[PDB]
Write a protein that binds this ligand. Structure first.
Ligand SMILES: *C(=S)NCc1ccc(NS(C)(=O)=O)cc1
Ligand SMILES: *C(=S)NCc1ccc(NS(C)(=O)=O)cc1
Ligand SMILES: *C(=S)NCc1ccc(NS(C)(=O)=O)cc1
Lengths: 114, 114, 114
């Protein structure tokens, strides 16, 4: 799993431990060990959501499997909750794109997961 | 609809009002209320296009529907026109990737659009 | 072809000529002329891989064709080799997502490619 968050909130507002929390909670939610999980947080971005530059986030979760209707609803509850409590972003100003990757289309360590 | 533009032109060359314009233009182009549109502009990037570091852009447009052959041709003229007029980027130094998302694969407000 | 690298390596550790090298190597590997290739390198990112913030990279290779099981394994060796040598990133801390784009979903120069 790979989780990316782009946000307009300032870097100084990202709390200590946030990357680790995303890693831990994504391991719990996807069932993949933390060693398999990558996270990327991009603050200070020029962004608007609904025509407003109030705090917002655009995110993506890529995963080899573990993507689907009910799973994605659960991930959205989890991830919006973290963005609200940690980054102060209202859940109605977050989009998350979910991508189910074929293992042959994910490279790692001089090979792919096919 | 979510529109992202990454460019090597400097931040100071992004005009005041650009995010608002992108929101309004995309609302009209997709026929959707502006409350649904998210935009993200990333200047000052380390980029090359065709081996050259002259002004360029790499963009993406994600939407649940409203993506397809004819629509994408229209979006490309609109978006290249905005990048040319507002950021002085030649249309032949712009790539835009168009992504049609399933509703179940887009999270928002603690759930998904499914 | 469009190649994007996101990394926590600092900007000063990205060697001069890296974008040109990526362009030339991708031209050889994909068979497309350099004129067709775009590259984007994003240093200084806030990232973790397996819960650790040692040097890592999350990358994408989009291409109209030239994507598949065997090709992607070859690209991963090429790209992990370059990231290891040029950015000093361990290859087990690199993920690369491969995307085969339909030409009708790629905009350029005021229209699409199909
Ligand atoms: C998130 S995208 N992690 C990468 C990853 C690597 C391997 C697997 N398992 S396998 C080899 O496909 O069975 C899952 C996720
Ligand atoms: C851009 S990605 N905006 C979000 C959004 C939400 C819904 C829809 N379409 S629908 C028919 O309501 O599912 C499109 C875009
Ligand atoms: C990488 S994604 N380069 C873009 C690109 C554009 C055109 C072509 N050829 S064609 C026959 O016009 O579609 C290949 C790659």
């Amino acid at each position: 799993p790979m989780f990316i968050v782009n946000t307009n909130v300032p870097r100084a507002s990202v709390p200590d431990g946030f990357l680790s929390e995303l890693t831990q909670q994504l391991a719990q939610a996807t069932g993949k060990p933390p060693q398999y999980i990558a996270v990327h947080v991009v603050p200070d971005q020029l962004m608007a959501f609904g025509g407003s530059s109030e705090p917002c986030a655009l995110c993506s979760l890529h995963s080899i499997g573990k993507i689907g209707g009910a799973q994605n609803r659960s991930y959205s509850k989890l991830l919006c909750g973290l963005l609200a409590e940690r980054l102060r972003i209202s859940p109605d100003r977050v989009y998350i794109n979910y991508y189910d990757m074929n293992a042959a289309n994910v490279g790692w360590n001089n090979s792919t997961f096919a």
